[PDB]
Amino acid sequence: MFLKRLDVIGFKSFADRVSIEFVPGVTAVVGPNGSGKSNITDAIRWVLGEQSAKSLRGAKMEDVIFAGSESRKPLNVAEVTITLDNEDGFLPLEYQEVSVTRRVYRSGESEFFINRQPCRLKDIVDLFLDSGLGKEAFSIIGQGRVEEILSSKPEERRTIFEEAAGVGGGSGEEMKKRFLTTFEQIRAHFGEVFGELFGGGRADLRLTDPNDLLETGIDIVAQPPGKKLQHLSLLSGGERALTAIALLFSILKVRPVPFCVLDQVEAALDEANVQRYAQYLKRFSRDTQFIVITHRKGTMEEADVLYGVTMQESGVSKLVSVRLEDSKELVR
Amino acid sequence: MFLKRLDVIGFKSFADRVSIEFVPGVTAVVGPNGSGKSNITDAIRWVLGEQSAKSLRGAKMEDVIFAGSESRKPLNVAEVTITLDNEDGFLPLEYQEVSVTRRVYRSGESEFFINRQPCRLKDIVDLFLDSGLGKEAFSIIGQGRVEEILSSKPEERRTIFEEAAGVKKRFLTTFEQIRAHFGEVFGELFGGGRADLRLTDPNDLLETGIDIVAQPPGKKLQHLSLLSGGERALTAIALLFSILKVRPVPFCVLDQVEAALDEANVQRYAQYLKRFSRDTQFIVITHRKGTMEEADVLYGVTMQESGVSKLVSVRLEDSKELVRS
Numbered sequence: 001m002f003l004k005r006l007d008v009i010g011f012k013s014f015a016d017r018v019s020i021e022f023v024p025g026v027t028a029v030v031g032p033n034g035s036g037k038s039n040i041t042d043a044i045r046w047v048l049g050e051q052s053a054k055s056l057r058g059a060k061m062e063d064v065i066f067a068g069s070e071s072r073k074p075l076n077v078a079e080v081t082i083t084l085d086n087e088d089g090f091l092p093l094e095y096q097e098v099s100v101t102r103r104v105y106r107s108g109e110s111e112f113f114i115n116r117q118p119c120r121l122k123d124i125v126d127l128f129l130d131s132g133l134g135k136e137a138f139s140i141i142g143q144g145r146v147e148e149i150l151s152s153k154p155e156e157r158r159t160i161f162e163e164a165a166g167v168g169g170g171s172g173e174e175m176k177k178r179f180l181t182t183f184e185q186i187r188a189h190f191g192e193v194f195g196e197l198f199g200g201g202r203a204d205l206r207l208t209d210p211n212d213l214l215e216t217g218i219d220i221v222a223q224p225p226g227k228k229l230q231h232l233s234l235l236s237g238g239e240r241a242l243t244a245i246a247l248l249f250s251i252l253k254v255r256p257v258p259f260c261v262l263d264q265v266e267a268a269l270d271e272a273n274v275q276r277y278a279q280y281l282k283r284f285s286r287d288t289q290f291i292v293i294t295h296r297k298g299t300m301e302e303a304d305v306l307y308g309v310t311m312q313e314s315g316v317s318k319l320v321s322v323r324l325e326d327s328k329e330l331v332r
Numbered sequence: 333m334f335l336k337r338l339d340v341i342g343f344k345s346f347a348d349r350v351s352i353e354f355v356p357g358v359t360a361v362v363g364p365n366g367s368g369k370s371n372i373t374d375a376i377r378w379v380l381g382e383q384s385a386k387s388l389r390g391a392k393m394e395d396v397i398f399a400g401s402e403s404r405k406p407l408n409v410a411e412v413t414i415t416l417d418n419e420d421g422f423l424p425l426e427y428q429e430v431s432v433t434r435r436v437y438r439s440g441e442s443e444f445f446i447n448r449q450p451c452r453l454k455d456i457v458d459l460f461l462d463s464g465l466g467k468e469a470f471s472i473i474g475q476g477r478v479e480e481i482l483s484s485k486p487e488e489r490r491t492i493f494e495e496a497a498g499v500k501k502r503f504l505t506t507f508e509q510i511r512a513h514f515g516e517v518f519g520e521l522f523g524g525g526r527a528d529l530r531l532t533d534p535n536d537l538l539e540t541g542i543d544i545v546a547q548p549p550g551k552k553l554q555h556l557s558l559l560s561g562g563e564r565a566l567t568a569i570a571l572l573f574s575i576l577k578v579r580p581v582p583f584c585v586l587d588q589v590e591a592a593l594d595e596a597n598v599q600r601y602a603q604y605l606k607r608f609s610r611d612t613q614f615i616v617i618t619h620r621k622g623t624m625e626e627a628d629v630l631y632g633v634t635m636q637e638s639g640v641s642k643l644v645s646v647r648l649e650d651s652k653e654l655v656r657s
């Protein structure tokens with residue numbers, strides 16, 4: 001398993017140190033509104049090298065430091081440490097176990113380390129630059145954001161595919177071949193994944209400009225069971241979400257990543273679709289490590305470990321391992 | 333005034349006429365993904381006079397005509413009729429029952445009727461002008477759009493308050509009344525904590541923006557943006573109910589606005605919804621049992637036949653498949 005551990009101290013609602021051990025397969029995170037779950041996903045984005053405070057729902061980076069509660073004073077530093085297993089050599093860093101630590105102080109000062117040795121933010125970025133982590137709409141799906149590829153411009157989608165393809169002269173010719181090759185693989189998987197998730201129907205991808213692989217956009221076409229193909233726009237909230245999930249899974253088949261974070265991607269899905277999704281997720285989890293925030297029983301039942309996050313104390317997150325038989329209040 | 337009936341004929345997935353009777357109180361519409369529920373809210377927007385096909389998920393207005401399915405051939409006309417109780421003379425017509433019809437043909441013709449007499453789109457728009465009906469973030473909330481006011485820039489928030497007010501001098505009066513409610517509604521919804529609305533520039537009111545302050549119980553005030561998905565959703569819902577308190581409407585359509593809410597917050601939302609239905613009729617699309625439990629009537633939308641929507645009254649105890657878990 002690639003993601004071994006996440007240590008969080010003073011980051012947002014986690015005033016006290018929490019240490020999260022991940023398992024192979026599916027790690028599910030559950031809990032009531034406002035407890036600190038999405039904050040964990042932010043901690044992951046941050047330690048991987050996120051440079052935009054707004055991407056972390058803040059205005060300035062100092063907003064990610066625990067700012068206090070009715071029961072506590074604000075802290076003046078936040079620290080996140082992620083521990084990774086690089087036995088295969090997935091990283092351009094020839095250590096067995098890799099750790100990355102990021103800190104920020106209320107002064108605005110920051111510190112970065114790789115395996116305990118001080119480094120630059122750029123070193124952390126460079127370290128993960130081609131790993132696949134932790135890119136939105138690719139390896140980390142934010143809450144509310146599952147439809148982001150669908151809502152993108154066709155031209156925007158080409159760029160996603162290019163990046164998944166590892167993309168002048170006859171090198172340009174080579175770039176064309178790679179893009180098309182990756183595009184054909186993804187397209188092929190997309191049709192199949194769509195069918196499995198919906199229990200039928202079909203989906204496909206199209207080039208908007210077949211004459212120009214540099215400039216073409218990508219159209220998405222999807223036909224749920226029983227329906228006539230119509231504009232993607234006319235599809236329902238749940239149909240659009242499940243189409244987005246099919247496309248995501250397909251991209252991850254073609255361009256694997258060491259772990260994927262999914263923050264309530266199944267919100268729009270009905271009971272039948274969540275079940276198909278959760279079983280697919282479980283199968284997929286053999287290849288790729290998933291960390292999911294979920295409120296759905298169907299997903300929780302497929303989980304290899306469940307962590308409940310709560311805020312008994314005003315403003316402060318607590319994380320414990322929980323059994324499903326008594327998470328019954330956390331079932332949507 | 334209230335909504336008595338909606339007839340939907342050939343509109344989107346409703347190939348066959350479906351006639352939906354409404355009760356005052358809360359009507360919940362339930363069913364599986366892709367079954368036709370949001371399409372019902374689109375029919376309402378459309379018959380009230382919506383001009384933008386894009387607002388209805390289409391590209392051209394023709395897109396709202398049943399376009400065929402695996403089972404059924406495409407149709408060439410779509411028609412929606414809404415029927416309203418005008419006993420009180422809410423509407424400036426002397427009829428006690430008012431109906432409005434809109435049609436579109438695949439060939440491009442339109443018809444508009446008020447009480448069966450042909451009219452223009454403008455006459456329907458003018459008819460409902462003072463009602464406040466079919467206004468996004470006000471009297472209708474589309475799927476996925478509950479945070480529309482919260483995620484608006486302070487200046488854009490103002491315009492919404494203007495439509496709510498009636499758009500000098502009128503903004504401010506409306507703002508202050510909504511502000512006075514927002515604090516209470518936010519507490520009642522969360523079970524505590526404090527919130528407020530603030531004017532950026534109180535000295536210029538054709539221009540100034542509105543800031544929103546929201547602090548859940550025991551938590552400390554930071555940027556609105558740092559609140560959780562469920563917390564922002566419940567805040568937006570508090571603001572919506574605050575708007576409805578001051579600029580009330582005869583009916584309000586809510587398409588899965590409680591999606592981000594946990595079970596406890598759904599329960600508080602749903603009880604609040606029931607109480608609010610004293611003054612306003614609610615038609616809600618929902619998958620949540622707390623909401624279904626507070627509904628006065630439940631309608632289940634399904635596609636037994638591929639691509640074609642049908643609706644029937646359903647019992648809660650027969651709808652366990654539909655309850656989100």
Ligand SMILES: Nc1ncnc2c1ncn2[C@@H]1O[C@H](COP(=O)(O)OP(=O)(O)OP(O)(O)=S)[C@@H](O)[C@H]1O
Nearest residue numbers: 012033034035036037038039065066067560561562
């Ligand atoms: N710098 C900070 N200091 C203290 N608390 C914070 C800070 N930043 C954010 N929070 C709080 O952390 C709480 C939990 O945030 P999230 O992790 O977004 O909640 P969640 O568990 O994802 O809840 P959902 O999406 O409603 S089920 C929110 O109330 C924030 O207000």
Ligand SMILES: Nc1ncnc2c1ncn2[C@@H]1O[C@H](COP(=O)(O)OP(=O)(O)OP(O)(O)=S)[C@@H](O)[C@H]1O
Nearest residue numbers: 236237238344365366367368369370371397398399
């Ligand atoms: N003109 C049309 N002809 C036939 N079908 C249409 C037309 N317009 C939309 N639809 C279908 O309506 C379906 C979407 O229905 P909605 O009413 O949005 O679903 P929903 O019941 O809200 O489902 P959710 O949001 O996932 S629980 C799509 O699958 C479309 O194929």
Ligand SMILES: [Mg+2]
Nearest residue numbers: 038143560561
């Ligand atoms: Mg969240």
Ligand SMILES: [Mg+2]
Nearest residue numbers: 236237370475
């Ligand atoms: Mg819908």
